[PDB]
Amino acid sequence: MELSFGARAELPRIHPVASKLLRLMQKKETNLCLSADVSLARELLQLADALGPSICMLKTHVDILNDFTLDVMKELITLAKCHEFLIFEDRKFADIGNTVKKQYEGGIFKIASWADLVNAHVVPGSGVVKGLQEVGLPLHRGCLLIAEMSSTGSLATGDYTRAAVRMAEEHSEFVVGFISGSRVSMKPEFLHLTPGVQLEAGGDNLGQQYNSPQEVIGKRGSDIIIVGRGIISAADRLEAAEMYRKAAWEAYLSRLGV
Amino acid sequence: MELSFGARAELPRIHPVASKLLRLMQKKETNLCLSADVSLARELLQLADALGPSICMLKTHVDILNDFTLDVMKELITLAKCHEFLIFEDRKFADIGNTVKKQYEGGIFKIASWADLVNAHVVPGSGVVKGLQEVGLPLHRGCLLIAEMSSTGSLATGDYTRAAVRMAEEHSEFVVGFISGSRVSMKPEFLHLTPGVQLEAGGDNLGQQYNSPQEVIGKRGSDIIIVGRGIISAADRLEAAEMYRKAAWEAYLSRLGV
Ligand SMILES: N#Cc1cn([C@@H]2O[C@H](COP(=O)(O)O)[C@@H](O)[C@H]2O)c(=O)[nH]c1=O
Numbered sequence: 439m440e441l442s443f444g445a446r447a448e449l450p451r452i453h454p455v456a457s458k459l460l461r462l463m464q465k466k467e468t469n470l471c472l473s474a475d476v477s478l479a480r481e482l483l484q485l486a487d488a489l490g491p492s493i494c495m496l497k498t499h500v501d502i503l504n505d506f507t508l509d510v511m512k513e514l515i516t517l518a519k520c521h522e523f524l525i526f527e528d529r530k531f532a533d534i535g536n537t538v539k540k541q542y543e544g545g546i547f548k549i550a551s552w553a554d555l556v557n558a559h560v561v562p563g564s565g566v567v568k569g570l571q572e573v574g575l576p577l578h579r580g581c582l583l584i585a586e587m588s589s590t591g592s593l594a595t596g597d598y599t600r601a602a603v604r605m606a607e608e609h610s611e612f613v614v615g616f617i618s619g620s621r622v623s624m625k626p627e628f629l630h631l632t633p634g635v636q637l638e639a640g641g642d643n644l645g646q647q648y649n650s651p652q653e654v655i656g657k658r659g660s661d662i663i664i665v666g667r668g669i670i671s672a673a674d675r676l677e678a679a680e681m682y683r684k685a686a687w688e689a690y691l692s693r694l695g696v
Numbered sequence: 697m698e699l700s701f702g703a704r705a706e707l708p709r710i711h712p713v714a715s716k717l718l719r720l721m722q723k724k725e726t727n728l729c730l731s732a733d734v735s736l737a738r739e740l741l742q743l744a745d746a747l748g749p750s751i752c753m754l755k756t757h758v759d760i761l762n763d764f765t766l767d768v769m770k771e772l773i774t775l776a777k778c779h780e781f782l783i784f785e786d787r788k789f790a791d792i793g794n795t796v797k798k799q800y801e802g803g804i805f806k807i808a809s810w811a812d813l814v815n816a817h818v819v820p821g822s823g824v825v826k827g828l829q830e831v832g833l834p835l836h837r838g839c840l841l842i843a844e845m846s847s848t849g850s851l852a853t854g855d856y857t858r859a860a861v862r863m864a865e866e867h868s869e870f871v872v873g874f875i876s877g878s879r880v881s882m883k884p885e886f887l888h889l890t891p892g893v894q895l896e897a898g899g900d901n902l903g904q905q906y907n908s909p910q911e912v913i914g915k916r917g918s919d920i921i922i923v924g925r926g927i928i929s930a931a932d933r934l935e936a937a938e939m940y941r942k943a944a945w946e947a948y949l950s951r952l953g954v
């Protein structure tokens with residue numbers, strides 16, 4: 439009952455955003471999401487171009503860009519289209535519906551205009567999702583709910599995690615999956631994306647914890663690895679990206695039996 | 697014993713930002729924080745200028761400004777100094793320390809350079825505080841932990857709330873208080889700020905819930921009311937601000953005993 443990415447893309451209950459993603463993952467043999475945590479647009483675009491072929495998704499923090507403009511986003515979309523990857527803004531919407539609606543649609547970033555995917559914390563209750571949903575957009579858009587976090591002392595456990603899953607299942611018209619450390623939903627239509635990934639054991643000095651692709655994808659049953667520093671801080675970024683891609687891909691293959 | 701704002705300003709263990717706030721609260725007889733959720737810089741500045749005399753604090757969502765620049769913040773600083781209020785950016789930092797550090801110091805908004813106060817969700821664990829503190833501590837900035845939320849279905853309850861209080865108490869060099877619905881700490885050095893306030897019973901259509909100043913300050917023991925739509929939507933914003941100020945102030949006085 440474990441299905442390939444390509445098969446999952448065709449599930450009756452699949453969201454169009456999820457389908458698109460799943461299809462390209464299968465085509466490109468990648469379940470790697472690059473976390474492009476950089477300070478300059480030039481670097482963001484360089485990464486997108488060089489590593490585009492190796493990734494299913496590019497995760498942005500547009501607020502960390504010193505020189506964000508929508509023109510930058512236009513260029514990013516072009517690369518996304520070229521290389522075939524989704525854009526995920528790691529916005530972490532985390533307030534009342536009325537506020538997040540505005541934060542998604544409007545303001546300086548105009549996130550909804552370019553981000554295939556965003557994420558939200560579940561702490562405010564389901565209003566956080568409802569608010570995001572109320573943004574009118576004749577484009578295919580999805581949301582990921584933060585069900586678990588990668589950091590030491592995370593409170594996104596137990597009943598909290600269950601709450602996230604329930605909220606997702608109840609808003610499946612928009613919510614396409616999770617940020618989690620493992621498989622949290624038994625429903626194959628939902629994507630699992632996992633940050634806190636490096637080839638080596640460890641962490642950082644500010645509460646990040648790392649697990650390997652084999653652990654996260656293979657043992658813990660997640661779908662996609664999110665990797666920042668493991669790539670962007672590497673001596674050879676393309677080489678690193680390819681290692682991560684191959685690691686995650688093989689780990690995934692291991693679940694498909696035969 | 698319940699202390700006045702002015703007395704609290706003098707507590708041995710008081711944070712400088714907290715002391716500054718408390719002093720101006722006492723001076724101006726205001727425990728009202730204006731929430732200015734506006735789409736134009738001009739409107740932000742206009743409201744800050746007009747309402748400044750009535751408020752202890754102005755809460756911003758800079759990301760909702762269609763036309764944010766650092767020059768806007770330059771101008772806000774001027775108004776804040778003139779009228780005597782603190783600037784609180786409602787950023788809701790909510791990730792690993794390494795990331796939030798960047799989101800606080802850098803990028804497009806350079807929040808730490810102008811915000812007296814910011815807030816953080818506690819869901820990622822204490823790394824969120826550690827990351828922010830590295831930037832903010834030596835700049836005499838302060839942080840508020842989101843211990844409770846105003847929205848329907850909020851998960852910031854019970855053990856979650858208790859975790860926020862512990863985290864605050866353990867980072868008292870930087871954490872100066874809470875976003876909460878009520879008094880959550882018995883330590884008078886900590887500030888309690890409460891959104892979800894209007895004179896009238898009700899809510900919005902996206903999960904916001906309202907309670908009155910008398911209820912939240914008087915009965916529930918919070919310190920400061922955060923009011924958005926209740927003021928901004930009024931025909932006469934000045935009158936509205938004054939009504940809210942008078943309500944919150946009297947509710948506070950009521951706790952001060954014989
Ligand atoms: N939600 C969420 C999370 C997001 N992230 C984000 O994923 C990225 C991890 O980057 P890195 O540690 O450099 O591989 C970084 O942008 C961070 O903000 C987590 O690390 N953990 C989470 O739980």
Ligand SMILES: N#Cc1cn([C@@H]2O[C@H](COP(=O)(O)O)[C@@H](O)[C@H]2O)c(=O)[nH]c1=O
Pocket residue numbers: 533534537731733757786788815842844845846847875891892893904922923924925926
């Ligand atoms: N943390 C936090 C919260 C922030 N806020 C913010 O406070 C403001 C309330 O605005 P209003 O409902 O218009 O009075 C708004 O900017 C919203 O994003 C809450 O309403 N509830 C919270 O729990």
